Amino acid sequence: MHFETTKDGFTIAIGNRIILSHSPDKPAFFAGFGEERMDMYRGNFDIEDYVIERTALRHAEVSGDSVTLSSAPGQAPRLRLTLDGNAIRLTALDETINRLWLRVVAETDEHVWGGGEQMSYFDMRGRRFPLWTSEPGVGRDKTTEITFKSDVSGKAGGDYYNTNYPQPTWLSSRKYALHVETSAYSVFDFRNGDFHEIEIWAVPEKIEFFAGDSFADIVSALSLHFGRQPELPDWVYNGAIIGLKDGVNSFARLEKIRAAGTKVSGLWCEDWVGLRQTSFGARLFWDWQANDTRYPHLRQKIAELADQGIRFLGYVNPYLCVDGPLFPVAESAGYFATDVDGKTALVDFGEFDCGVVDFTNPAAADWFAAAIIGKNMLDFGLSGWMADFGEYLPIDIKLSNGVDAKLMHNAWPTLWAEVNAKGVESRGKTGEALFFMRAGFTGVQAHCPLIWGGNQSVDFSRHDGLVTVICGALSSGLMGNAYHHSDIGGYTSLFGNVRTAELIMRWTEMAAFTPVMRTHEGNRPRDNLQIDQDETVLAHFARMTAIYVALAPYLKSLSAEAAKTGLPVQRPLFLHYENEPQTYAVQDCYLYGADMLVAPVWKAGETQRSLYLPGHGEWVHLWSGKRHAGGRDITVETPLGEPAVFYRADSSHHRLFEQLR
Ligand SMILES: O=[N+]([O-])c1ccc(O[C@H]2O[C@H](CS(=O)(=O)O)[C@@H](O)[C@H](O)[C@H]2O)cc1
Ligand SMILES: [Cl-]
C-alpha cells in the first residue's frame, strides 16, 4: 500500500484506490473515551454509549517509517500509524483511548457488503451496523407486532443489524476489502456519501486490506486469510437431514417420511439429550450425553439406521445446566467462568441456569473436545450435530486468561468453533463429521464446516422470515463461509405465529438449491405443522429431495470449487456480472454456482415470480426448458413445486439440468 504526502496532509492507497485521506480540515482519525452500558437479558443486549471525548486528530507528522497523529500542533501524539505490507498498524500512544473512529474514502455510487452474516441488508450502504454477537431478535422490525411483543415480554425483538455472526470486514464495489483485527465492539457507519466511518471501542492492532481484479479474486484472498472449509462429506448427497425431537416416536415418523419416497441422508434428533419444558416451549436438557430415558436404545438405533444408509446427528452447546450431572464434574475441575468473587458464574437462559465452560482455560477446552465432542458424541456414533450458541458471554464475568469479557465476548464463537473442530480432528473425521453453527466471528471460517441461518420466525416476514436466509447466505459467503443452510419452515413460533403448508413448501423449494436440506420441529412442535403431517406437503418434500439428489453432482463440483478457490456455493449476481451495476444490491436471488440462478418465492399467495436475468447469453428455465435471453426482467409461473430456477445454456452440466425438466 502506498503512502503519499499532499499540500496539507497525506493519502494511503491500495493500487490506484485511495483509502484514507487526511488533512487538518478533513481528518481521517478521531480518538476519545467512553463509558458504555451493555445490559444482557437472555442473550439480547441493550447497548448504549456515553461518549465523554471524541476529538479529531488534526495534526500528522512523519516519524521514521510511521506517521504520528495529535489533536493539534504542539500536543503530544496520541496514535501512531505504520504501514506493514497490506496492513496499517496502529499503536495507541495515549493509553487512555478506548474509542477510535476512522474515515475511509467513499464514492457516491459505491456499494459495501459483508459485515459477517447480515440478515436484513446485504448492501450495507446508507445505514449503520454495530458488530456485536447476540441473539438476532424475533421479528427484528420495530413496526411489526411480533417484534413489539418480543420486546415487551423479553427484550427480544432485536433490529435489522443484530446477528449471531457479526464480523468487522467489508467488501467494497471499488474492488478492495477491509478487515479490522479486533474483537472489541465496533460499528460500520455507511450513512455518508463521501466516507465510510468505523467506530472501534479499542485501538485495533491493525487494519488489513485485500485487493484484486475481480470480486471473485478478493473473496479467494479473504477465504485464504480466514481459512477455508473442507469439502462436504459424500453422505450429505444422499438426501435430507430429517429433524425430529419426538423421542422414540421419531423413528416411526421417519419411516413414514421414507415411505413417501423421501431421500434421506440423516436423522437429526436434538432431543438426544432429553427435553426441558419451559414457557418458550420444548427446549432441550443441556447435559451433553445420550439420555437413556428419552432414547433407551439409541446406540442400537444408530446402528440400524447406518444399515439403511442413514446417519445420525445430535446437538451440543458450550454451557452446562446446573441440574445436570456434568455440571459438578466441570465445576470440580475449575472449568467454568467465574463471577467477581471467584464462584461459578450462573447465567439465566430462560427459566434455567447454566455454567459457562471457560475455553480460555486450555484444560477446559481440551476436556470439552475430548470428553464431550470425542467420547460422548463421535465415539457414540454421531456423524454430526448442531453446534449451537456462542453469542451469550456476559460482560461481567471473569475468564481464566484474565482478558476482559468485553473483549472475549465476540471471540467466543470462534473459540467454540475451534473446540468442535479439535474434537472432530482427534477422531480423524475432518471432512466426514458435519457440525453446523449459527454464531460466528472472525476466524470461525477455519473451524466450522457449515453455517446455518439461526432462528427465523415461521413466516414470510421481510426482517425475520424466509427471505432473510438469502441475505445471510450471500453476506456470510463473501466473508469466506462457503456453505449455508436454514431450518426448512423456520423455527420461532410465538404469539400465535405458526407455520403454514405453503411456508414449508416454499422453504423446501429454496433448500433443495442449497448445500444441505434439513428440517426442524421448532420450539413448539405440536403447535406447528411438520413435514410428515400433511400428504401434499410430504409429497412435495419427497419430490424436492429427489431433485436435490439428482443435482448432487453439480453441488459436489461447487464444493470442490469452494475448497480450491474459496468461492461460496451461493453467490450474489454481481460476482459473475460485474459490469451490471444495477445488480449490486440484489439480495433475494442468488447464483447457485456460476451456472444456475435461483429466485425463491418469499411471500404468501404468489403464483409467479419476477426477476432480472443477467448477462448476454441464454438462460433455460429448469422446469419447462424455455430459453430466454440474458439482460432483462422476466416473470415466470411458480406453482408449488416449480421454483424460479434457470441454468446457463452453455453449462458443462447441461445434460444433468435437462434431466430435471
Ligand atoms: O433465548 N431463547 O429462549 C432461545 C430459544 C431457542 C433458541 O434456539 C436455539 O436452541 C434451540 C434448543 S433449546 O430449545 O435452547 O434447548 C434449538 O432447537 C435451535 O435450533 C437453536 O437455534 C435460541 C434462544
Ligand atoms: Cl407466546
Domain coordinates in residue numbering, the chain: 1-212, 213-569, 570-661
Residue type, 448: C
Q: Which resolution, in Å, applies to this structure?
A: 2.0
Q: Alpha helices, DSSP H only, in 199-353? A: 215-226, 249-259, 298-307, 326-333
Q: Strand 434-436 and strand 29-41: pairing? A: unpaired
User: What CA dihedral angle connects 445, 354, 39 and 32, to 10 degrees?
Assistant: -50
State the closest ligand 1 atom to the C-alpha of 285, by its place in the atom list counted from 1: 16
Mutate to test the pocket of ligand 1, among 45, 165, 283, 391 (most ligand atoms within 8 A of CB): 283
CA 138 / ligand 2 centre spacing (Å): 12
State the closest ligand 1 atom to the C-alpha of 276, by its place in the atom list counted from 1: 16
Q: How far is residue 296's CA from residue 462's CA, in Å, rounded to a whole number?
A: 42
State the closest ligand 1 atom to the C-alpha of 349, by its place in the atom list counted from 1: 1
Number of residues that this document lists for the chain? 661
Q: Whose CA is nearest to atom 15 of ligand 1?
A: 283
State the closest ligand 1 atom to the C-alpha of 281, by its place in the atom list counted from 1: 14
Do the beta carbons of residue 185 and residue 85 sit within 8 Å? no
Q: Which helix (H) or strand (E) holds 556?
A: helix 535-565
Query: By what method was this entry solved?
Result: X-ray
Mutate to test the pocket of ligand 1, among 135, 244, 270 (most ligand atoms within 8 A of CB): 270
State the closest ligand 1 atom to the C-alpha of 270, by its place in the atom list counted from 1: 18
Name the grid cell of 294. 428419552
List, in order, residues 6 or more apart from 85 with CB less than 8 Å away: 1
CB atoms within 10 A of CB 143: 9
Cα separations in angstroms, 77 against 66, 67, 99, 198: 12, 10, 16, 21
Nearest alpha-carbon partner for 185 in 336, 444, 410, 367: 410
Nearest listed ligand to the Cα of residue 40 = 1
| Vertex 518 angle, CA 517 and 519, to 5° | 135
Q: How many alpha carbons lie under 13 Å from residue 307 in its C-beta half-sphere? A: 6
Q: Whose CA is nearest to atom 11 of ligand 1?
A: 283
Work out whether the CA dihedral 535, 537, 541, 547 comes out positive or negative.
positive
List, in order, residues 6 or more apart from 552 with CB less than 8 Å away: 237
Residues flanking ligand 1, CB < 6 Å: 42-43, 270, 280, 283-284, 350, 388, 438, 454-455, 491, 520, 523
Q: Whose CA is nearest to atom 10 of ligand 1?
A: 388
Q: Which helix (H) or strand (E) holds 53?
A: strand 44-56
State the closest ligand 1 atom to the C-alpha of 386, by its place in the atom list counted from 1: 20
Classify burial at 109, counting beta carbons within 10 Å of its beta carbon; exposed 0-12, middle 13-18, buried 19 or more.
Answer: exposed
Name the grid cell of 599. 429466485
Q: Whose CA is nearest to atom 24 of ligand 1?
A: 135
Q: How far is residue 619's CA from residue 597's CA, in Å, rounded to a whole number?
A: 9
Q: Whose CA is nearest to atom 19 of ligand 1?
A: 455
Q: How far is residue 185's CA from residue 326's CA, in Å, rounded to a whole number?
A: 33
Nearest alpha-carbon partner for 420 in 391, 377, 379, 453: 377
Q: What CATH class does 570-661 carry?
A: mainly beta
**DSSP letter string over 507-548?**
HHHHHTTSS--BB---S-GGGS--TTS-HHHHHHHHHHHHHH
